[PDB]
Structures are given as C-alpha cells and as structure tokens.
Amino acid sequence: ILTIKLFLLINQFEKQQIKKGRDITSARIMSRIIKITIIVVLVLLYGEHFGMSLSGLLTFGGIGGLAVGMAGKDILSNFFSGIMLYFDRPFSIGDWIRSPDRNIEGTVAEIGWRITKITTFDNRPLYVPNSLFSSISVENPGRMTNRRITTTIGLRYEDAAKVGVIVEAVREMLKNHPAIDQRQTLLVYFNQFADSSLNIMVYCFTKTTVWAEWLAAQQDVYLKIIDIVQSHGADFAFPSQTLYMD
C-alpha cells in the first residue's frame, strides 16, 4: 500500500509536469528516476522483515551514501550559501558590487536560493553561484562615500628648476577648487624619476559620488592642471631617446 500511494503521488506529479508544458520523454525519465530512488530507499529502510543479512545492507548503503555525498557537494553548498545570504547579506538589491578575485562586477538584480542574478554594465544578465560569496572578498562601490582623482604629471628633465613652483600652484588650485573635499587626503608631490620625465603625483577626492559629476570635475581639474603647467614655462614630456650615429 505504501508503494501504491507513492507511485500514485509521483504519477500525479508527472502529469502536473506535463501539463506545465515540457518534453514528454524528459518527464518519463524523471518519473523513472524517482521510482528507482524511492524503491531503493524503501528497500534499505524496510529490509529486515522480509530482508537480508544485516551486514550486506550496511556496506551497500554506506557505499551508496558515500558516493552520493561526495557527488552532490556543490549543489548543496550553493543552497547553504543561499540560506547564509538570506540571514547575513553584505549587499542589497540595486547595489553595485565587485570582487578582486572573480569577475562578478555589476548591480545586484535578484538574490535566490541557488544563484544570484546581476546586471552587468553592458546590460547583460550574469548568474553567480551562491557558494562564491563564501570564499571571495566582495567590494561594494555602491556604498562609497567619495570618488577619487589620481593622476601623474610628467615634466621634462630640463624643467627641474620649476618643479617646486608648479607643485605649489597645483596644490593651491586643488585647495581652492569648490568640487574637492577638503577633509580627505590631498597630496601633490614630486616622487619619481621616470625614464623620460620627472613625475608628480596628484591624489584627491571629490564631494560627489555621481558618475557624470565626478567625470566633469576631473575634466575641469585636468584642464586647469594643463594651464598651470604651461603658464610656468614647462611642458609635458614625450618618450625620449638619445641616438648615436655611425
């Protein structure tokens, strides 16, 4: 009677799957698989009243369960990480996330039990297995407080007498710029002997976090830097070489 009840239940499931709309052969194969699995489980559970030697079933079930346990580790790990994400999540829907270990960059669209769906920046869907969120570092640029501007000014080696005044002028310009956050790091220093130029680092932050506003402020700063450099008699350096001719 137990076998009849289980068979009728999975038969109802099978016609349910068919009515949902699916290939018939696949439904038959899945129904079989469930049939054999249920039969094996019942035989192992109900194998003493009409059963066998109590040593054979132990070994057989141990081998089968051991093989199944190592075979299904990844599928179960994904769902376990999904439960963990449900309880403790480092991001929310709509957050732009990133990782230095794997390519998962994009904005979160859906968080599921098995995979997370993320919209990339070329408008494509990306499906990430949940287990990855248990072994890699996740960065959240969507929760940033400032946008950083970093650049290098490469002057000619013959402009060594004007490095200090140029550095001071650039620092003053950055300090008086209305779009620059004055409570964050602000460094302008000459710090590198390059192959063909003397390099000056520029390192600052903007108040805004909007993409277009940050880009506009960066462009304005770059143009002002060009004007400052060219007004002091210096110039930017191309790659240079010394040629000896026969």
Residues that bind ligand PTY (CB under 6 A): 28-29, 32-33, 35-37, 39-40, 43, 63-64, 67-69, 72, 75-76, 79-80, 83-84, 87-88, 112-115
- What is the pairing mode between strands 198-206 and 125-129? unpaired
- Which among 5-13, 39-47, 169-177 is the span making contact with its own copies, rule CB under 8 A? 39-47
- Tell me the CA distances in angstroms from 14 to 5, 8, 25, 28, 38, one per residue in order: 14, 10, 11, 8, 15
- Report the candidate in 200, 192, 204, 205 with the shortest Cα–Cα distance to residue 232: 200
The entry of ligand PTY, its own copies, none near residue 16 (CB within 5 to 8 angstroms by kind) is none
Question: Is 146 one of the binding residues for its own copies (CB under 8 A)?
Answer: yes
Token duo for residue 148 = 């950083």
Instruction: State the nearest-atom distance from the C-beta of 50 to its own copies, in Å.
Output: 11
Nearer to its own copies, 11 or 141 (CB): 141
Instruction: State the nearest-atom distance from the C-beta of 14 to its own copies, in Å.
Output: 13
Question: Is 94 one of the binding residues for its own copies (CB under 8 A)?
Answer: no
67/4 Cα distance (integer angstroms): 29
- What is the pairing mode between strands 106-111 and 115-119? antiparallel
- Binding string, 210-229, against its own copies, x = CB under 8 A? -xx--xx-xx--xx--x---
Q: Specify whether the CB–CB gap between 155 and 198 falls below 8 A.
A: yes
